[PDB]
């Protein structure tokens, strides 16, 4: 999989808080990033997953995490969706348009026979390495709280090399210190 | 990704409740399955995660879900690990050995420079279709409760396609 | 060159008069067809050209001509655009979504570096043969009346094989009949 | 697709106002150029279209636009035709001969089974970029008035970048100024 | 060289005595044929040669020989030239138009850099076998009396097999009988 | 065809007036040359043709024209034939032997199934450019008077550039001056 | 075969006398080496053979010979096996883990359909040259005394090239 | 390695007890075989390894094991060596000559830059599967008694499937019975 | 290498005792054949060798051996040579002409830079198998007596399979009978 | 064909007069060399030919000619053969072993299906050029006296470049001098 690989260069237009901006990989350097892919704008389902990320966005920015939602629609479409839907209107992070499919293909996330991205979330660290990946079928919700947890854990191992976060790890809980004597002990 | 693709045929030995059994894709037919990959027996993060899945195993079995843990170690090694660790001894689901690495590569989950599988979880429906995928870096834990929630969502949308807004 | 070539098979979803439908090359067999490509929904030059075609749609249907607008946006986006623009709301012809870009490539009409189609119009006869092509750069509008004139002329020539319609030909004006005697005499 | 691509180099003999001249792409640089392809000298639809362009050549020159008609006949034949037809006699622009077919193939406009060019018109700006294309079937005549309209719109857009001419736009009519604000409003 | 090879199939339009016709390889079956290539209509050297052939056309028809002049101009152009020039107006043989160059290339007679044929003459027998070739350079005119001489000699060789026409063979002169005894005796 | 191409380099042994010599492309530089190919020594038709050329050899030498007869036999064989035949004994020009076939193939004149050259004559100018070609079939003899006619005409064209020899041009007859005014006047 | 070829570069983790160490070809330079491959930890034939080499290890060390056992299991597994079996606990030479299988394939010794090494022994001289090779089927035992004899013969011919008839 | 693979077909001449015979793989079917390779006949070293096998040959035949020694010399050379050396004279098994190198290459045992086989011994069971392999450098003796041991062990596991022979196994000694309960126990 | 390979099919014209004949491989079947290649007719070393074979042709015919001399000259040249040289005049065997070089290349005997065959002699048995080859440099003569010796030995060996003729073997001398017993004894 | 080609580089071990040596192409530079190939040591026809060459070895060394016998056997085998055959014991020239077959393939002399060389002899001059080749089938012996004759002739021609040695030429007999006058006169 693309776990533990570096993200590839990209250049896309985006809608962000009433403005059109350009995003490239250079904007991700030195930062934590979340690439949040979804198939299409303006479908008949409430865009809850994106709204749930927007609800957590202040906290994600406090942790220095930037969020980019991505679909193969244009930034023009994103802007109209943002005006037409109260849920989407809550989004203050960048909505990237990827009509060439190139960003989606960099993350190996294209449904080629449909021309739409799959429902994938990628966590990328400040050096561009992918640290977590989540892909679900339609109807299987992506929980923004499990995403926050994973990010906090990724930030923790980065700040404490020599330690690993066991299952269900949360802040305050015990970590493990990989060693010879710990081999076969747990 | 492999989302929404059918799992590939496989044939592997496993340790399960004190015996060595053979597992193939025919054992997954008509059942919900969780393929739980981890890098290596006799290490550290791997057992807490495996133990957390063992703690929910009764519940997963009430939902018609089978669990298969997979690493590139042999079934011999799993048996030995099951006898020596208190956390692993709780496991009652099948521990598959994948020394040729074929099952891992079928799930595109190999660390090729280490010969070990990445920390990946796959939810596979009764038709062999992969419905959820999770992969994390060495040190970021999986949450068995989030896995359960997803499995319940997957079962619900299968039973009731189209219930949305 | 796609002039005097046969259209290739396609299968696309479309928005037409409040519903979603499938459109394929078989729906064009036996009919006159206009494939009207444009780059993106929710932009500026695109709606005026599409509305202008919607104004001639009653006349075109009386001539047996079906209209298909095409962009690489999805059919969901078309529907949304249709509900929010007064200009697009008057479209009663099929709005095809081509997110894989396969129909656009069939017509060799993709801006590959943008993932959007160019501003191209094609006139296709009942046998699937393209009889007229028009392509313009981003800021130059098309004129549906010139489009109509070309369709009428195309119909005449199909209906009168040993005749040809000269420059600026309108219904009822003097046509020419290619022969040995007429050679070099105009 | 040739829209928005640069014309290729060429070198051809042409008949222009009683003399044979050489035309190359260097003659087109810094000028607006119309390449008017037609299938054959001493035929029927071909002269009426060429005469119609001649009727507008005074205005086109006034706007800095050069015209080049092109067929696979030789420049010798164009001269004989100029002398024998009262319509061709009024042509004051260069009548290019393309017997190798090289210029016709640069514009991808050969009828390979006939060795004759198709009825295509290309509008080229001072930088060599193709801004408008029109191709019609053998029996359908082109309309010089619509060619004029397009040239004027292409010239306007060159001069007012950030503006675009909507459908049916003519000199002295309202133009659109793309902005974030205007998206989805028309 | 193409001496003693079979002509390849062809299908070309032509002008012959005020009418347009189709010529193919079937029209030459069972007949003797002269393919007279020249570079271009409405030029200078070409008509004098074509006229010289026209003068000898009755004699040729008596010998069962058909003439086919060829250039890469169209049959429309040949008609106009036929009406235009007093030299060309006396041609009663078929003027083939070869705008695709296929017929010229079958006889490996194309000037690929000009798209015009060279000045070549081919004698073809009733079985389609080329028995004589003549190619001269741009500006050197051919002479039909030579052509007739070669034709008469070709026909004798066919009607009297086992004999050969020596240099300067004219009707009534001695012919050689190839044999073992004659080897090195001349 | 090879008309108006430059001869390729060659190196062959030859027999000339009781002596063996080497001939290369350098020996033809600055001179007019006639390459007279024939199929085989000690045959029947070949000597009569070679003799006919021998008769005209003084006239040719006055015009600065050198003769080179060629066959795929060796120079040893040419000598023996020179001693053996009264027709051949009168040849004072160089008899080239081309047993490798390289020289024959440079002139695309090989009968690949026999390993013998066809009956072809090539006129080459001082710059090595072929100005006239003649190929006849096994058994049709060539005529040197024709050859001289083509040679004299080739030389005039070279010494008076901007003029062209019409059909049947002989010394003293009118020549054409290619121009614009003359197009379609003949 | 690989007889008389130079061993290829490698980098692997090993268990040795209670610690994890890294082993590369630089540790073999200037020494006589025995590479002892076996299919899998926590099995049957493998330990008797490994124990027999452990019984001669003091002697092999008196002759300047280093021993490396190799299997496709991890160094973690070797450590666990060393703690649980009385036969393996006697091993004081390095137990190399080869999970990517690179060291095994360098010696052309992989059972590709099992992901396990074949039962092969290689004797490698101080210049990296392979001087003796032995490979046996599953179930045919290696003889550590025959190995010793060969190592002594290899050392003798190296010291005294040409002493024959 | 070739361990546990089937031997490939072969056809070689051999010297055996004063006679020349032919050996193919068909002679190995249903039998145990030992292929004993060695570099060359008639060198300056006493051929002890081959003599040591000859000393054990009666016993090997009682166990139904056939022996074939192989080098790239001819069977002619083997026969002369057998007459000249007392050690070689003891050999009653087949001495195969392999001058094409094909048998040696089937067992991947060629030193290609020398054209001699390496010092390899292969034990092959009645189904053609290689069960043991031994390769040594020069001076490192192959012990025929270790070979007998291996063979007895190979024959034993074949006769008692479900059992394996541990290290140093000899007849009378205990075997192991691969089972789950034995896992990690030894 | 051609020793012990079968001759390839061929079809050539030849001069034999005042007539031209066709020779093919079918003429060689069931006969012993000598293919005597030489570089050129009317040269120096070539006739002395050919005459020497002629001196032995009576004996060769008596032994059922046919002879074929071969060069790249034509059969016409062989006849002229037969008439002019008292040495060649005594040749009663077929003098094959190989102007395509095809027969010479079948025997791999072309001097590719000269288009002449090298001085090679091949002995072919009734089954088409080449049993003896001799090739010499340009200046070295072959000896027909040694050719005879070889033919007689090849015929003896055909007749006494299991026997061989040793060095210097001549009719009625001791021959060897290969056996195991004779190995290493001579 | 290896006639008149240069020998290729080689490096082989040999047995010569009681010792083992290396032989390469450099040992032949500046000397006359005979490469005498034979199939196998310890056989029947081979020794009589080799002994026969050993009988002329004193004469050959007086002529500056070195002899090399070659087989695919090893040099060890040669030595052994040398010690056991009365015939081989008289060989004082180098006996090359070619177990890789590389020298035999250089001379294109391998029986690939046997791994043995054919019965071929090559005469090589001081410049490494092969001047004579002889190959015979398995039972036909070579004659060293014919070999000597060819070497002498080869030496003469090298020593007298404008001369050639005819058929059956022996030292002192009449040689020929190729020239124009001698053509066709023998
Ligand atoms: Cl385009
Ligand atoms: Cl050969
Ligand atoms: K799209
Ligand atoms: K043309
Ligand atoms: K493993
Ligand atoms: K030839
Ligand atoms: K050999």
d(CA F116, CA F104) in angstroms, rounded, equals 9
Local structure of residue B137 (DSSP, 8 states)? -
Q: Does domain G1-165 have CATH number 3.40.30.10?
A: yes
I15 → chain E, closest CA residue: E180
Among F46, F54, F67, F117, which one carries the catalytic annotation? F46
Give CA–CA dist B159/B164, Å, rounded: 13
Q: What is the C-alpha to C-alpha distance for residues C169 and C183, in angstroms, rounded to an integer?
A: 20
The rounded distance, in Å, linking the Cα atoms of F57 and F16 is 13
CB atoms within 10 A of CB H25: 17
Closest of I11, I14, I34, I9 to residue I74, by C-alpha: I14
Distance, in Å, from the CA atom of A151 to the CA atom of A172, rounded to the nearest integer, reads 15
E162 HSE (CA, 13 A, CB side) = 2
E112 touching chain C per CB within 8 A: no
DSSP reduced 3-state for B27: helix
Give the one of H41, H81, H115 whose C-beta lies nearest to J100's C-beta.
Answer: H115
Q: C-alpha dihedral over G116, G119, G125, G126, to 10 degrees?
A: 40
Quote the DSSP letter at residue F25.
G
Which residue from C42, C76, C101 is facing A76, i.e. has the nearest CB? Answer: C42
Which of I14, I34, I46, I153 is flagged as catalytic?
A: I46
Report chain D's C-alpha Rg in angstroms: 17
A162 CA to middle of ligand 5, Å?
Answer: 24
Between the CA of I157 and the centroid of ligand 2 the distance, in Å, is 19
Three-class DSSP category at B97 = strand
**DSSP string computed for chain A:** --TT-BPPP-EEEEEETTEEEEEEGGGGTTSEEEEEE-S-SS-SS--HHHHHHHHTHHHHHHTTEEEEEEESS-HHHHHHHHHH-HHHHT--SEEEE-TT-HHHHHTT-EETTTTEE-EEEEEE-TTSBEEEEEEE-TT-PPPHHHHHHHHHHHHHHHHSTT-B--TT--TTS--B---STTTTT-
Q: How far is CA E127 from CA E5, E61, E65, in A?
A: 10, 18, 13
Q: Is H186 near chain B, with CB under 8 Å?
A: no
Name the β-bridge partners of D71: D97
Q: How many CB pairs below 8 Å do chains H and I form together?
A: 11
With CB atoms and an 8 Å threshold, state whether A184 touches G19: no
H-state helical runs in C56-173: 57-62, 75-84, 102-106, 144-159
Largest CA distance in chain J: 59
Q: Is the minimum CB–CB distance between D180 and chain A shorter than 8 Å?
A: yes
Q: What are the C-alpha distances in Å from C56 to residues C68, C148, G62, H63? A: 13, 8, 102, 100
D139 interfaces chain A, CB cutoff of 8 Å:
no
- How close is the nearest chain G Cα to the Cα of A39, in Å? 38
Question: Is F80 close to I79, i.e. CB distance below 8 A?
Answer: no
Residue A21: what are its φ and ψ, rounded to 5°?
Answer: -135, 170
F79 has a chain I CB within 8 A of its CB: yes
Characterise D53 by phi-psi region: left (phi > 0), alpha (psi -120 to 50), beta (else): alpha
Distance from CA of J94 to the nearest CA of I (A): 19
**CA distances (Å), origin H34, targets A163, H12, H53, H131:** 57, 16, 10, 10
**Record: contact A42-C79, CB cut-off 8 A:** yes
Alpha-helical (H) ranges within chain H are 48-55, 57-62, 75-84, 86-89, 102-106, 144-159
| Cβ atoms of residues C150 and D134 within 8 Å | no
User: Are E69 and E60 in contact, with CB atoms under 8 Å apart?
Assistant: no
Report the DSSP beta bridge partners of residue E7: none
Please, what's the b/e burial string for G62-80 (b: 16 or more CB within 10 A of its CB; e: otherwise)?
A: eeebbbbbbbbbbbbbbbb
Q: Across the interface, do E115 and D76 touch by the CB < 8 Å criterion?
A: no
Portion 39-58 of E in contact with F at CB < 8 A: 42-45, 47-49, 51-52
Q: Report the alpha-carbon distance of residue G26 to residue H109 in Å, rounded.
A: 29
- How many C-beta neighbours within 10 Å does residue D105 have? 15
In this complex, the chains that touch D, judged by 3 or more CB pairs closer than 8 A, are A, C, E, F
J43 phi and psi, to 5 degrees?
-115, -150
D20 touches chain F (CB under 8 A): yes
Note whether D67 and D93 are within 8 A (CB): yes
Distance CA J151, CA J126 (A): 12
Element holding D151 (H helix, E strand): helix D144-159
Which residue spans within chain F are E strands per DSSP? 11-16, 19-24, 32-37, 65-71, 94-97, 110-111, 116-117, 119-124, 130-136
HEC states along chain E? CCCCCECCCCEEEEEECCEEEEEEHHHHCCCEEEEEECCCCCCCHHHHHHHHHHHCHHHHHHCCEEEEEEECCCHHHHHHHHHHCCCHHHCCCEEEECCCCHHHHHCCCEECCCCEECEEEEEECCCCEEEEEEEECCCECCCHHHHHHHHHHHHHHHHCECEEECCCCCCCCCCECCCCCCCCCC
Query: Residue D115: what are its φ and ψ, rounded to 5°?
Result: 70, 25
DSSP B42: S
Please name the chains neighbouring I, where neighbouring means 3+ C-beta pairs under 8 angstroms.
Answer: E, F, H, J
8 Å CB contact of D164 and C45: yes
Taking a C-beta distance cutoff of 8 angstroms, is the pair D131, C140 a contact? yes
Per the listing, tokens 């902005």 go with D179
Q: Which of chain D's residues have a Cβ under 8 Å away from the Cβ of F184? A: 76, 79-80, 83
Using the structure block, give the residue that is written with the tokens 């590569």: B105
**Chain D CA closest to residue A83:** D184
> Terminal CA-to-CA distance of chain A, rounded, Å?
28
Distance separating alpha carbons of residues A34 and H94, to the nearest angstrom:
74
Active-site residue identified among J7, J23, J34, J46: J46
SS3 H18: coil
Q: Would you say C107 and C15 are in contact if contact means Cβ atoms under 8 Å apart? A: no
Are the C-beta atoms of D112 and E101 separated by less than 8 Å? no
CATH of domain D1-186: 3.40.30.10
Residue C144: φ, ψ to 5°: -65, -25
DSSP code for D88? G
CA-to-CA distance for G71 and E82, rounded, in angstroms? Answer: 94
How far does H160 lie from chain G, in Å, by closest CA? 11
For residue H163, the SS3 value is coil
- In this structure, how many other beta carbons lie within 10 angstroms of the beta carbon of residue E72? 30
Neighbours of ion ligand 2 (CB under 5 A): I 1-3; J 135
Annotated catalytic residue, options A3, A45, A46, A63: A46
Full 3-state SS string of C9-59: CCEEEEEECCEEEEEEHHHHCCCEEEEEECCCCCCCHHHHHHHHHHHCHHH
Instruction: Looking at the complex, report in whole angstroms how far the Cα of residue B100 sits from the nearest Cα belonging to chain G.
Output: 4
If you search the block for the tokens 């090195």, which residue do you land on?
E184
Measured torsion, CA atoms of residues C80, C82, C83, C89, in degrees rounded to the nearest 10 = 180
Set G34, G46, G60, G154: catalytic member: G46
Beta-bridge partner residues of E11: E24
Judged by CB atoms closer than 8 Å, whether chains meet at A186 and B48 is answered as: yes
Task: Residue H183: list chain B partners with CB under 8 A.
Answer: 76, 79-80
SS3 string, chain J, reads CCCCCECCCCEEEEEECCEEEEEEHHHHCCCEEEEEECCCCCCCHHHHHHHHHHHCHHHHHHCCEEEEEEECCCHHHHHHHHHHCCCHHHCCCEEEECCCCHHHHHCCCEECCCCEECEEEEEECCCCEEEEEEEECCCECCCHHHHHHHHHHHHHHHHCCCCEECCCCCCCCCCECCCCCCCCCC
Describe the crossing of helices J45-55 and J144-159 by its angle, rounded to 10 degrees: 50
Looking at the complex, does the CB of residue F74 fall below 8 Å from at least one CB of chain I?
A: yes
At B128, list the tokens: 């062999």
Would you call J162 an interface residue with chain F, using a CB distance cutoff of 8 Å? no
Q: Are E139 and F169 in contact (CB under 8 A)?
A: no
Q: Which of I157, I130, I146 shows the shortest CA–CA distance to I3?
A: I130
Closest ligand to Cα I120? 2
DSSP assignment string, chain G: --TT-BPPP-EEEEEETTEEEEEEGGGTTTSEEEEEE-S-SSSSHHHHHHHHHHHTHHHHHHTTEEEEEEESS-HHHHHHHHHH-HHHHT--SEEEE-TT-HHHHHTT-EETTTTEE-EEEEEE-TTSBEEEEEEE-TT----HHHHHHHHHHHHHHHHSTT---
CA–CA distance from G20 to each of B41, B76, B98, G58, G75 (Å)? 16, 22, 24, 21, 7
Quote the CA–CA distance of A43 and A139 in Å, as a whole number.
13
Rounded CA separation D99/J63 (Å): 75
Query: Quick one: tokens of F16?
Result: 């000339």
Q: Cβ of A80 and D180 within 8 Å?
A: no
What separation in Å is there between the alpha carbon of D134 and the centre of ligand 3? 27
Residue J108 CA to ligand 2 centre (angstroms): 7
DSSP 8-state symbol, I90: G
Please give the method by which this entry was determined.
X-ray
Hey, what are I73's tokens? 């000259």
Question: J116-117 and E19-24: which strand pairing?
Answer: unpaired
Query: Is C103 strand, coil or helix?
Result: helix
What would the two tokens of residue D153 be? 């719109």
Using a CB–CB cutoff of 8 Å, tell me whether A20 touches chain C: no
**Angle between the G45-55 and G144-159 helix axes, to the nearest 10 degrees?**
50
Terminal C-alpha separation, chain B: 27
Nearest to H9 by CA among H27, H24, H29, H31: H24
Residue D70 forms beta bridges with which residues?
D37, D96
Tell me how far the alpha carbon of residue D116 lies from the centroid of ligand 4, in angstroms.
7
Task: Please give the C-alpha separations between residue J74 and each of A49, C53, G102, H114, J12, in angstroms, as whole numbers.
Answer: 81, 93, 39, 10, 10
Q: Are J52 and I151 in contact (CB under 8 A)?
A: no
Contact residues for B8 (Cβ-Cβ < 8 A; gap 6+): B25, B106
- Helix (H, G, I), strand (E, B), or coil: what is residue D126? coil
Q: Is I167 on the interface with H (CB under 8 A)?
A: no
Cβ contact, residue pair C80, A116, below 8 Å: no
Token pair 């943008």: residue:
C114
Tokens of I112: 């590719």
Cβ pair F133, E133 in contact under 8 A: yes
Q: Between G72, G74, G113, which is nearest B40 by CB?
A: G74
Angle between helices A48-55 and A144-159 (to 10 degrees): 50
Give residues with Cβ within 8 angstroms of F150, minimum separation 6: E136, E140, F123, F131, F132
How many whole angstroms separate alpha carbon G119 and alpha carbon G39?
A: 7
Q: Please choose, from the candidates G154, G135, G149, G162, the residue with its C-alpha nearest in 3D space to the C-alpha of residue G35.
A: G135
G3 is an active site residue: no
For residue I142, what is the DSSP state? Answer: P
Specify the DSSP class assigned to residue H26: G
Cited resolution, angstroms:
1.9
Measured in whole angstroms, the distance separating CA A143 from the mean position of its chain's CA atoms is 12
CA atoms within 13 A on the CB side of F130: 23
Contacts of range H159-167, beta carbons closer than 8 Å, 24 or more positions apart:
H163/G139, H164/G44, H164/G45, H164/G138, H164/G139, H165/G45, H165/G139, H165/G140, H165/G141, H166/G44, H166/G45, H166/G48, H166/G49, H166/G141, H167/G45, H167/G48, H167/G49, H167/G51, H167/G52, H167/G141, H167/G142, H167/G143, H167/G144
Whether the CB of H79 is below 8 Å from some CB of chain I: the reply is yes
Q: Residue J2, Cα to own-chain centre: how many angstroms?
A: 14
- Please say whether the beta carbons of G29 and G128 come within 8 A: yes
F105 touches chain I (CB under 8 A): no
């Amino acid at each position: 999989s693309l776990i533990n690989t570096k993200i590839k260069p990209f250049k896309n237009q985006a809608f962000k808080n009433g403005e059109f901006i350009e995003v490239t990989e250079k904007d991700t350097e030195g930062r934590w990033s979340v690439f949040f892919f979804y198939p299409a704008d303006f479908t008949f389902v409430c865009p809850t997953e994106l709204g749930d990320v927007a609800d957590h966005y202040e906290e994600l920015q406090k942790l220095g995490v930037d969020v980019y939602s991505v679909s193969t629609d244009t930034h023009f479409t994103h802007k109209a969706w943002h005006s037409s839907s109260e849920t989407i209107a809550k989004i203050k992070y960048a909505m990237i348009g990827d009509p060439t499919g190139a960003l989606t293909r960099n993350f190996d996330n294209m449904r080629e026979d449909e021309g739409l991205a799959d429902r994938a979330t990628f966590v990328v660290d400040p050096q561009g390495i992918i640290q977590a990946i989540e892909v679900t079928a339609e109807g299987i919700g992506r929980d923004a709280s499990d995403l926050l947890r994973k990010i906090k854990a990724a930030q923790y191992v980065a700040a404490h090399p020599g330690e690993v976060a066991p299952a269900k790890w949360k802040e305050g809980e015990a970590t493990l210190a990989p060693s010879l004597d710990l081999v076969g002990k747990i």
